[PDB]
Write an enzyme that holds these catalytic residues in place. Structure first.
Site, PDB file in Angstrom:
ATOM      1  N   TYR A 109     148.581 111.723 -15.309  1.00  0.00           N
ATOM      2  CA  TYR A 109     148.093 110.741 -16.285  1.00  0.00           C
ATOM      3  C   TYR A 109     147.394 111.375 -17.483  1.00  0.00           C
ATOM      4  O   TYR A 109     147.188 110.702 -18.494  1.00  0.00           O
ATOM      5  CB  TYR A 109     147.177 109.706 -15.631  1.00  0.00           C
ATOM      6  N   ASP A 140     147.019 104.810 -19.335  1.00  0.00           N
ATOM      7  CA  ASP A 140     148.454 104.658 -19.596  1.00  0.00           C
ATOM      8  C   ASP A 140     148.714 103.390 -20.407  1.00  0.00           C
ATOM      9  O   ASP A 140     149.448 102.462 -20.002  1.00  0.00           O
ATOM     10  CB  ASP A 140     149.268 104.711 -18.280  1.00  0.00           C
ATOM     11  N   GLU A 184     140.798  95.880  -8.108  1.00  0.00           N
ATOM     12  CA  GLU A 184     141.065  94.587  -8.767  1.00  0.00           C
ATOM     13  C   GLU A 184     140.713  93.375  -7.900  1.00  0.00           C
ATOM     14  O   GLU A 184     140.192  92.357  -8.406  1.00  0.00           O
ATOM     15  CB  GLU A 184     142.525  94.517  -9.154  1.00  0.00           C
TER      16      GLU A 184
END
Ligand SMILES: [Hg+2]
Ligand SMILES: [Hg+2]
Ligand SMILES: [Hg+2]
Ligand SMILES: [Hg+2]
Ligand SMILES: [Hg+2]
Ligand SMILES: [Hg+2]
EC number: 2.4.1.40
Length: 263
Positions: A65, A131, A221
């Site tokens: 990443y 990203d 999340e």
């Protein structure tokens, strides 16, 4: 203490003309939902500059990443809090691989190899994924004690379709008759104090789940969604702020695509 705004000339707000008639612009707990057309950015810029606001932007870039940092930071320079003090914090396992990106004045970048430092250095923290790319204005309209962002896949969904954690054995559990929105983990923030409260709460809940042998369906999340159910955010960002154009196109309801997935 907040000083007076200067004289400014702008269009009078019209009490009897709704702002947007196609979307909800305020939550039931009276938090604004931030869509294009709802804010005069000149007024907000004045308010936040007069407080000499500093915004921290945090990103984790591990393993492959790190490749996304160059585009992320270059586009942040064009679109993120331009005119305001910005401190980027890049958390990475590869400090020497962080690209040399040219920054505007009043903007700085710290590389942290993988805290109270945030309390002394910035007023607000914004926590995003690397990203991504900025494609349009992301500015002080988002700043508030605590915000979350409407997940682009679920903003039109009924609450029973939300991918909340549904097992009662998890600390992130939300039953089918609860929930306001499905917030995406990839863009949240707030004052330093409120962000640290949130991250502490999620970290503790995740430890409890680990001890009980359970991992929430969407990990951090899922815990974010539980936290924001029980501690209502003071602003909610529309999906303008977290979009994937290849997956979802460009619906009429989005006047701007501000911060997007990389193709
Ligand atoms: Hg409006
Ligand atoms: Hg953060
Ligand atoms: Hg982060
Ligand atoms: Hg939490
Ligand atoms: Hg966590
Ligand atoms: Hg969280």
């Amino acid at each position: 203490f907040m000083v007076s705004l200067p004289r400014m000339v702008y269009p009078q707000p019209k009490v009897l003309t709704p702002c947007r008639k196609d979307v909800l612009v305020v939550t039931p707990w009276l938090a604004p939902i931030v869509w294009e057309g709802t804010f005069n950015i000149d007024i907000l810029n004045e308010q936040f500059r007069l407080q000499n606001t500093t915004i921290g932007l945090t990103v984790f870039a591990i393993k492959k990443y790190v490749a996304f940092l160059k585009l992320f930071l270059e586009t942040a320079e064009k679109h993120f809090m331009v005119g305001h003090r910005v401190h980027y914090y890049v958390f990475t396992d590869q400090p020497a691989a962080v690209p040399r990106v040219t920054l505007g004045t009043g903007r700085q970048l710290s590389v942290l190899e993988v805290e109270r430092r945030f309390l002394s250095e910035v007023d607000y923290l914004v926590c995003v994924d690397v990203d991504m790319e900025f494609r349009d204005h992301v500015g002080v309209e988002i700043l508030t004690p605590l915000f979350g962002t409407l997940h682009p896949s679920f903003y039109g969904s009924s609450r029973e379709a939300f991918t909340y954690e549904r097992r009662p054995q998890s600390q992130a559990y939300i039953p089918k008759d609860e929930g306001d929105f499905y917030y995406m983990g990839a863009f949240f923030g707030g004052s330093v104090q409120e962000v640290q409260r949130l991250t502490r709460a999620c970290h503790q809940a995740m430890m409890v789940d680990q001890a009980n042998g359970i991992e929430a369906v969407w990990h951090d999340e899922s815990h974010l969604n539980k936290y924001l159910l029980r501690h209502k955010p003071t602003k909610v960002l529309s999906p303008e702020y977290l979009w994937d154009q290849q997956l979802l196109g460009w619906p009429a309801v989005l006047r701007k695509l501000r911060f997007t997935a990389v193709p």
